Amino acid sequence: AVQQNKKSRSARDMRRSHDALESNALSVEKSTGEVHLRHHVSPDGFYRGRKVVDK
Amino acid sequence: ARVKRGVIARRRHKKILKLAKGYYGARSRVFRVAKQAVIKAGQYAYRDRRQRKRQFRALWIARINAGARQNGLSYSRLIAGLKKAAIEIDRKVLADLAVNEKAAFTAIVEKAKASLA
């Protein structure tokens, strides 16, 4: 099936009112000061104040 | 002599689209829909120049009716008395006195009652 009348500008923009994106949970590593995702290893290799992967 | 239509066609569309300002959707930005809206808006404007005279007279009557009954008289008995005495003030001025110059409206009403009508 297909539309009988084309949708308007307002009709299609009302449908997109639920398309806004969310923001993640970012924490600051207390020892150094790097910003990482919450509950994730730092981009440097730190988690909860400990080297874990040494790059 | 070949004639090109580009320049006079553009001025003719722009006259219609300028009258369609403030309309909704395609009625103010595409010519085909805007032309019909401008024609229809001119039919209503012609017709509502007549209704405007009807709607205001009905408003004046409804307000003289309210003002006459505060003085103890209906609208139809007031008009009969006013024609009977001599008075020929408009309905537009009678409705204005009913709201603002209430002490002048009272004198006119008791003049109409004194005409035994």
Binding site: D19, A20, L21, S23, N24, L26, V35, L37 | -
Partner: protein, 110 residues
């Protein structure tokens, strides 16, 4: 102040790229960069290079400081589109449009 930076012919659609652009409008430059560094969207990687260079333009050309700045203006315009052909069933052909956009970021101490 109001230093700008533009990226023309960004190889991504404007509707896709405008979802990211709404996240950083009016925010400070310091925190708008974190929000883009931890985003899964592809537009957030393209728009992170435009913002990072709009800050650099405010440094070399206007002697500003990163702390004072904030994203005063950001918008996404359309661009040229490439037109291709996609073969469908029963000998039919469809037209594919590959869309692009222009990304513009302005920073200002004001």
């Amino acid at each position: 102040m109001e230093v700008a930076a533009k990226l023309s012919g960004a190889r991504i659609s404007a509707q896709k790229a405008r979802l990211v652009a709404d996240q950083i409008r009016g925010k400070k430059v310091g925190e708008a960069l974190n929000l883009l560094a931890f985003s899964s969207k592809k537009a957030a990687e393209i728009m992170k290079k435009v913002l990072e260079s709009a800050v650099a333009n405010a440094e070399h050309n206007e002697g500003a400081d990163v702390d004072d700045l904030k994203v005063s203006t950001v918008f996404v315009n359309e661009g040229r589109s490439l037109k291709r052909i996609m073969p469908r069933a029963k000998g039919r052909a469809d037209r594919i449009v590959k869309r692009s956009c222009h990304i513009t970021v302005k920073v200002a101490d004001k």
